[PDB]
Design a protein around this ligand. Structure first.
Ligand SMILES: CCCCCCCCC/C=C/CCCCCC(=O)OC[C@@H](O)CO
Ligand SMILES: CCCCCCCCC/C=C/CCCCCC(=O)OC[C@@H](O)CO
Ligand SMILES: CCCCCCCCC/C=C/CCCCCC(=O)OC[C@@H](O)CO
Ligand SMILES: CCCCCCCCC/C=C/CCCCCC(=O)OC[C@@H](O)CO
Ligand SMILES: CCCCCCCCC/C=C/CCCCCC(=O)OC[C@@H](O)CO
Ligand SMILES: CCCCCCCCC/C=C\CCCCCC(=O)OC[C@@H](O)CO
Ligand SMILES: CCCCCCCCC/C=C\CCCCCC(=O)OC[C@@H](O)CO
Ligand SMILES: CCCCCCCCC/C=C\CCCCCC(=O)OC[C@@H](O)CO
Length: 511
């Protein structure tokens, strides 16, 4: 003789469950599902479920929304933990839950702050304040503790109607517009009002023609045959296994010398120190040179520094024509942004004085500088990034030079097997080529090797989980996109105006 289904607390629990499901729906926006409308459905839920809530209730809803998104969208990290971590399966699940909860603090933060300063359900909350605040809370997610900016809905528009915005203001401009349009749709829905819907449709539609702009010019007098060797080496300290790996890569490469101007091996393809492989590298250099070809490859470089310690780098080196190999050559690239929990553990430097020496890792990776020159091979300028680094759009843009001919990324996504992880990673890699209007050569161990065209399109690809070479003709491009010239500071100016205007109005609403 009561209505327990209609209590205030129960209505809030219903919102938390829906938030969970609307968050998870957003995972469908990303590869390999590639249902870009799901990003709008997922953000509509976020914006609508937080209306007419107290701030702490809104924060809970935003946390649960994020938990659905990250819980369903980056649980592929389990595959690495469970295969290589040595830990009990329940510990592995809990670590993944912990990761998803951590990232959901930033969506709860967004929701809580939005509710406190813009409690009324209005077009200002959703179209002006929310985009600005989402930009700030997502920057923090990608910055705190080195950051993890995985699953930004703008990437889901690589093959969508908003892709033309990315070469002008970067992918974060697409995150901005999507939040704004999804908020206007949520507003139209709850107030049953057609005016915010029309506005939303116009704003969503205005960018459509930009997708037809080519900010670049092709250079066919520079077209070359490029080869990328996907060795598909399983994950491993055996010098024999090392030699079996050099055998696969060398024998796949030898018939391409004299035909492919550029040959590419993936991240850490040579699984030995550069100092222990001088005879191999200098012989290889000579074969490539005598046939007019160049080789770029990943390798681990423990380089003795002036303190007579070893900096261990995750490195790219060059050999052959136009890139004479040398241990002292500057024609190389050292990974700058290490993978959190992969190549380091955040907060480790603070805790190290107390750790027993026998428990510390044998070797830990050092960091190359934030800016490094393009690699040069066979006359070709290559702006390089290793693995996770390709998802850092501003950093890729900061290393880019107008004379860059190609973006280069080499990676090893074998850690995550047959999960959606490598596909999401591949999708973000495509956004860099669109933003900077250059082809991107992505060479991987077993995990989406491909040539991406200067508008983010897949020009060539080989299947995952195959030992095989991708060989094709590639053409470099020149020209500066607006985003390449400026970076993201124009979006920040817009964010500051939107946010200034919204905060001013919220303070006026009070007192
Ligand atoms: C029918 C209504 C009553 C049953 C449903 C109860 C209300 C909640 C349903 C939705 C749950 C929201 C998701 C919670 C997210 C966090 C989580 O579960 O644990 C993560 C943990 O690591 C946090 O520290
Ligand atoms: C080629 C041009 C492409 C760019 C189009 C991007 C559109 C988003 C940029 C900024 C838009 C300004 C904000 C307008 C929001 C106004 C608003 O929410 O009004 C709703 C209200 O009238 C409903 O009753
Ligand atoms: C207060 C609670 C503790 C601090 C806050 C939680 C922080 C997030 C917790 C994350 C735990 C581990 C996440 C999985 C890492 C997976 C991994 O190593 O991937 C990279 C690796 O495969 C690269 O070779
Ligand atoms: C550990 C100190 C206190 C807690 C802070 C840790 C959490 C903040 C830093 C972010 C962690 C993200 C964890 C997942 C990263 C692993 C991952 O992406 O694997 C590499 C993969 O992306 C390469 O394609
Ligand atoms: C962030 C919210 C949604 C997006 C709002 C912004 C919409 C921008 C629409 C497009 C504007 C075109 C910008 C001017 C580009 C022309 C220009 O710079 O010409 C010189 C060119 O060579 C630069 O590379
Ligand atoms: C008010 C209307 C009713 C609420 C529910 C409708 C909107 C949200 C849709 C519900 C759930 C989303 C499920 C899709 C995401 C799951 C998914 O693909 O996960 C894949 C991933 O786990 C693979 O590792
Ligand atoms: C890695 C450590 C994660 C700790 C997660 C604590 C939250 C547990 C979630 C349980 C129920 C849902 C309601 C949570 C509301 C508060 C919240 O999570 O975030 C609030 C946000 O303002 C944080 O800045
Ligand atoms: C596990 C993915 C479930 C897809 C269905 C979406 C609707 C349910 C709620 C959304 C996401 C899962 C939330 C719990 C956290 C996920 C987690 O720790 O998973 C670990 C496990 O999947 C690793 O294999």
């Amino acid at each position: 003789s009561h209505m327990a289904f209609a209590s205030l607390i129960e209505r809030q629990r219903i919102r938390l469950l829906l938030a969970l499901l609307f968050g998870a729906c957003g995972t469908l926006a990303f590869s390999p599902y590639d249902v870009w409308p799901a990003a709008i459905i997922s953000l509509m839920g976020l914006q609508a479920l937080t209306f007419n809530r107290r701030p702490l209730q809104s924060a809970a809803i935003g946390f649960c929304w994020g938990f659905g998104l990250f819980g369903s969208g980056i649980n592929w990290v389990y595959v690495s933990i469970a295969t290589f971590g040595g830990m009990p399966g329940p510990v592995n699940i809990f670590l993944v839950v912990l990761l998803a909860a951590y990232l959901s603090l930033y969506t709860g933060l967004f929701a809580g702050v939005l509710s406190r300063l813009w409690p009324k359900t209005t077009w200002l909350r959703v179209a002006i304040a929310a985009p600005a605040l989402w930009q700030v809370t997502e920057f923090l997610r990608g910055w705190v503790l080195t950051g993890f900016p995985w699953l930004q809905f703008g990437y889901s528009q690589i093959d969508g109607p908003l892709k033309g915005l990315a070469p002008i203001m970067g992918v974060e401009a697409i995150n901005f517009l999507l939040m704004m349009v999804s908020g206007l749709l949520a507003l139209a829905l709850v107030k049953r009002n057609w005016r915010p819907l029309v506005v939303a449709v116009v704003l969503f539609a205005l960018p459509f023609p930009l997708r037809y702009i080519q900010w670049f010019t092709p250079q066919p007098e520079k077209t070359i045959q490029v080869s990328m060797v996907q060795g598909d080496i399983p994950q491993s300290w055996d010098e024999g296994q090392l030699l079996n790996t050099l055998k696969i890569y060398y024998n796949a490469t030898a018939p391409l010398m004299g035909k492919s101007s550029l040959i590419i091996w993936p991240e850490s393809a040579i699984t030995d120190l550069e100092i222990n492989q001088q005879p191999f590298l200098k012989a290889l250099d000579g074969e490539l040179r005598d046939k007019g070809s160049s080789l770029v490859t990943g390798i681990v470089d423990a380089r003795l520094n002036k303190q007579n310690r070893y900096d261990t780098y995750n490195t790219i080196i060059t050999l052959g024509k136009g890139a004479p190999y040398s241990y002292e050559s500057a024609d190389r690239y050292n990974k700058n942004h290490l993978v959190p929990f992969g190549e380091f553990v955040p907060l480790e430097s603070i805790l190290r004085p107390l750790a027993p020496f026998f428990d510390l890792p044998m070797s830990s990776f050092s960091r190359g500088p934030y800016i490094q020159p393009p690699l040069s091979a066979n006359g070709i300028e290559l702006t390089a990034a290793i693995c996770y680094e390709i998802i850092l759009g501003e950093q890729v843009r900061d290393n880019f030079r107008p004379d860059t001919d190609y973006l280069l990324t080499i990676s090893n996504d074998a850690w995550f097997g047959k999960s959606i992880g490598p596909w999401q990673h591949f999708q973000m890699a495509r956004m860099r080529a669109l933003e900077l209007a250059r082809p991107l050569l992505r060479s991987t161990n077993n995990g989406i090797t491909a040539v991406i065209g200067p508008q983010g399109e897949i020009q060539a690809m080989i299947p995952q989980f195959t030992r095989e070479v991708l060989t094709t003709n590639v053409t470099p491009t020149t020209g500066l996109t607006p985003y390449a010239r400026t970076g993201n500071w124009p979006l920040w100016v817009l964010t500051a105006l939107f946010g200034f205007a919204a905060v001013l109005m919220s303070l006026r609403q009070r007192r």
